Amino acid sequence: TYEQLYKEFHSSKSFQPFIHLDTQPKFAICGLIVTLAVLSSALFAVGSKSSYIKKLFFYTILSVIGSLFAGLTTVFASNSFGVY
């Protein structure tokens, strides 16, 4: 029981991470600009176009893009403060 795991441990190779830890503070500030631009233009078009269907359409699409960049923004922006 212990020997199968112990000979299976030395038979393997090491661990290669997906993105190195010293790169992420570039993607943090390179994400924080883009999500503020997209989300700001999203909340900017909630004014009086007086056209309900296209306002819901544009607002929903730009809210989707702003959400999916805010997620990666906060994940990379949390690993470079010291809380993993």
Partner 1 sequence: NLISQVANGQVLIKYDYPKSSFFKKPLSIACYIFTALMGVFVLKTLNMNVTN
Binding-site partner at residue 29 among partner 1, ligand EGY, none, CB < 5 to 8 Å by type: ligand EGY
Residues 6+ apart with CB under 8 A from 34: 69
Residue found by looking up tokens 């993105």 in the block:
19
Q: Rule CB under 8 A: is residue 30 a binding residue for partner 1?
A: no
- Identify the residue among 15, 47, 50, 83 touching ligand EGY (CB under 6 A): 83
Q: Rule CB under 8 A: is residue 23 a binding residue for partner 1?
A: no
Quote the tokens at residue 48: 């009086």
Distance of CA 46 to the CA centre of its chain: 25
- Subset of 18-37 contacting ligand EGY (CB under 6 A): 25, 28-29, 32
Q: Rule CB under 8 A: is residue 74 a binding residue for partner 1?
A: yes
Residue found by looking up tokens 């004014």 in the block:
47
